[PDB]
Design a protein around this nucleic acid. Structure first.
Lengths: 136, 138, 176, 35
RNA sequence: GUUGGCUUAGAAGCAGCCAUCCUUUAAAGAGUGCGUAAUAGCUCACUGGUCGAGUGGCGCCGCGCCGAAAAUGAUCGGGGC
RNA sequence: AGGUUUGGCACCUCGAUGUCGGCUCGUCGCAUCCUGGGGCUGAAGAAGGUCCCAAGGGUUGGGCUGUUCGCCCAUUAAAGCG
């Protein structure tokens, strides 16, 4: 909700930023293919997330739209598009961890995310943890 | 069509014919409302205000009634305890709480229709089912 | 724990990676060497050992060095280690993260609400001779309310917390 | 008697895979499907 | 003792939101399951006799399969593999 | 997915590719409107609902509008879409 905007499409090269690590939560949802995820999609996932286990734990959505997706009105050529119209999106490079759950069973957690994946226009993978950290 | 079966019931001792539990239940399930009911009277006559349980059938001993047996755990629990219905919510409410001794004792007392028999056993049963209700140990 | 650490000569990191090895490096104010292990090896150890407990490497020539993993790198696409720097311990007081354990069950069940491991394990200055396995968290008397952090831990001897102190190390929050 | 994303209604609903069609079904004609 | 909870008109798994103790051994259902008015019945989710052996659970890799409906006669360029 | 609508692009045709609708003559597609089969059903029967095979052959006459389309009249196994 700010700054001067209606920006350049730009492209998604290798996913040099497609691969973080569960930061909070317990289990997670990492992306396999690069893409633009419409807020419309995030919610549509998150919602079903919470909704899968009514009155459950916590949901963390690390990805976040901010890129304005413009579009023409159904005509020809003459200056950038009315822009936005539908809205904004976030850019996901294969490997980024989109959503992550916690405070619940793996049977409940794992199965929860699985659904989300159906909402997102990508191919996903689910992860656990115990991996990366900065301890000794 | 008629499938025989001893009827296991919990009812208002002192009374005899609780509309829902003895009208339908007994009569149609495999017994009889008001008759089993007056037998009830025969017994419940001196057990009736902390609720009373009896399984009644037309069985061996060649007769009708069967076995009267200690008013179920958790329930007699609150019963002696000091509350009406259920404490609405158990555990996540931790508001109904009783104590060690008076507990194990009341156990000893109700001990009749009690599996096996053991001081610690009955006491523990108390703490546990009591919890089941909201009758938690404290 | 322990596991062979074969000396890295210095040729084709991928060659390893791909072959079966796992490039690494061991160092301290004194030592600094190129090493390599084996996925299945390192994994089987770290997966459970991580970098909370001591790791001793068996160099092809007698050597038996006390170490810890300061940092491991990942190949974004499909998390798989790429490199590892090993901290060859000795005696000087050293820094390191030590695990924490949240036992019991703080109020948060009637209506729900779950905690949030705000700092699974923390770093505290300590001398190697003493290295606690994991530390305890006596939290269970706080609901959706506040949270604990900094000096709210029975940090044993030689455990001068090495943080702020102020780092919120835990917190309980509402459900969905 | 179906076409996608099935988990096997009931266990009775055993996956009957013949000819080429992957039609899983139980004893129940309600728990019956055909890919 | 389980048939503990609002709702019980009925939860007393086989209504739904709060439990997850106990008794006690064949063992351990804090009951995954066909139901109605609950309940009342059915199978192992536990265990002996023979039987005496590889069996259940997840996961990456190679190839392939379903997903796959169009208009003048069809075919991988053809034959045929 | 398809190329039936509305559009985008401006590649052949401006020393010319007559452009709605009707009529006549049709032929092909299946994503089937009838008529052949079949599985489910919250299918007792008679009806239906839905999905699956399957075009061999069918797929009416009028009122109103230039109409295609539609809305009506009267029927029909049906009055299919391209």
């Amino acid at each position: 909700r700010m700054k001067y905007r209606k920006q350049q499409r730009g492209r998604l090269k290798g996913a040099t930023k497609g691969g973080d690590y569960v930061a909070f939560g317990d289990y997670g949802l990492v992306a396999l293919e690069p893409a633009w995820i419409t807020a419309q999609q995030i919610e549509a996932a998150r919602v079903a997330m919470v909704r899968h286990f009514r009155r459950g734990g916590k949901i963390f959505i690390r990805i976040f739209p901010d890129k304005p997706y413009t579009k023409k009105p159904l005509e020809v050529r003459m200056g950038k598009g009315k822009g936005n119209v539908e809205g904004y999106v976030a850019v996901v490079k294969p490997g980024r961890v989109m959503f992550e759950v916690a405070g619940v069973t793996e049977e409940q957690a794992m199965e929860a995310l699985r659904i989300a994946g159906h909402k997102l226009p990508i191919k996903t993978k689910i992860v656990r943890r115990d991996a990366y950290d900065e301890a000794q | 069509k008629k499938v025989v079966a001893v009827v296991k019931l919990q009812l208002p001792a002192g009374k005899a014919t609780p509309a829902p539990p003895v009208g339908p239940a007994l009569g149609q399930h495999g017994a009889n409302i008001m008759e089993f009911v007056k037998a009830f009277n025969a017994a419940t006559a001196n057990m009736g205000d902390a609720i009373v349980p009896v399984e009644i059938t037309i069985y061996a001993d060649r007769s009708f009634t069967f076995v009267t047996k200690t008013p179920p755990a958790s329930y007699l629990i609150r019963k002696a305890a000091g509350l009406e219905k259920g404490a609405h919510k158990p555990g996540r409410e931790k508001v109904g709480r009783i104590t060690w001794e008076q507990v194990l004792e009341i156990a000893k007392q109700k001990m009749p229709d009690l599996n096996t028999t053991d001081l610690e056993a009955a006491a523990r049963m108390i703490a546990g089912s009591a919890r089941s209700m909201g009758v938690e140990v404290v | 724990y322990r596991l062979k650490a074969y000396y890295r000569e210095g040729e084709k990191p991928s060659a390893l990676r791909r072959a079966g090895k796992l490039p690494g490096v061991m160092y301290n104010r004194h030592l600094n060497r190129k090493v390599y292990v084996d996925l299945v090896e390192f994994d089987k150890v770290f997966r459970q050992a991580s970098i909370h407990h001591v790791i001793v490497l068996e160099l092809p020539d007698g050597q038996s060095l006390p170490t810890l993993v300061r940092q491991v790198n990942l190949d974004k696409r499909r998390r798989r280690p790429e490199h590892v720097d090993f901290f060859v311990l000795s005696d000087e007081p050293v820094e390191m993260y030590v695990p924490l354990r949240f036992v019991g069950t703080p109020a948060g069940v009637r209506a729900g609400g779950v905690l949030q491991e705000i700092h699974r394990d923390i770093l505290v200055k300590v001398s190697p001779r003493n290295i606690p396995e994991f530390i305890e968290v006596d939290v269970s008397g706080l609901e959706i309310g506040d949270s604990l952090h900094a000096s709210d831990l029975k940090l044993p001897p030689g455990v001068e917390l090495a943080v702020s102190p102020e780092e919120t190390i835990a917190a309980v929050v509402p459900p969905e | 008697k179906v076409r996608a994303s099935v988990k096997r209604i009931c266990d009775k609903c055993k996956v009957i895979r013949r000819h080429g069609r992957v039609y899983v079904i139980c004893e129940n004609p309600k728990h019956k499907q055909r890919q």
